[PDB]
Amino acid sequence: MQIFVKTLTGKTITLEVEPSDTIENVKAKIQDKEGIPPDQQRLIFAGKQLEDGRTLSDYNIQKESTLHLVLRLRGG
Template structure:
């Protein structure tokens, strides 16, 4: 915070800016206004605020993109297509649970394939770089069967 002191010296008015802790006084020329004095400081602060605001907006946009729900297609061996809504943070367990809700196939009997690889429990769609409108393959294991 800046306190302003007005000093009269030989009928000339001098303005002194003094910080709230009393240190580092700066003198103004008599024709300089407070706004002129503060303008460079305000400009630097404004630029810094705008840079920080932009970084926050970019972070929030990235976070929004990560959390945004999208659809993926689940293709069965009988060529039936199931659509589920997911996020990149959904785990394989979440996917099998969503498939179970739509098909009544228990999660422990489901194998999900993407890009020729079986998806492993504990990993997320982001781990496999699975995004919007991807097609996953569903293979059903019958009880007592091998895979």
């Protein structure tokens, strides 16, 4: 199924994922697409964070769901 990952820059990344996909794997795909380390990848859905040890079915994520990718840093 198709999902829409939105960034703080206003970018809408379209990724191909399935219910059996893992949240960690999704972040890995984004790392290959934009080049953002998993440490700086915070996936938020409806205001809550998704655990890496969960699937899209665990959060009842259906088709055309919008994923909020929160950018971050720990430098200063």
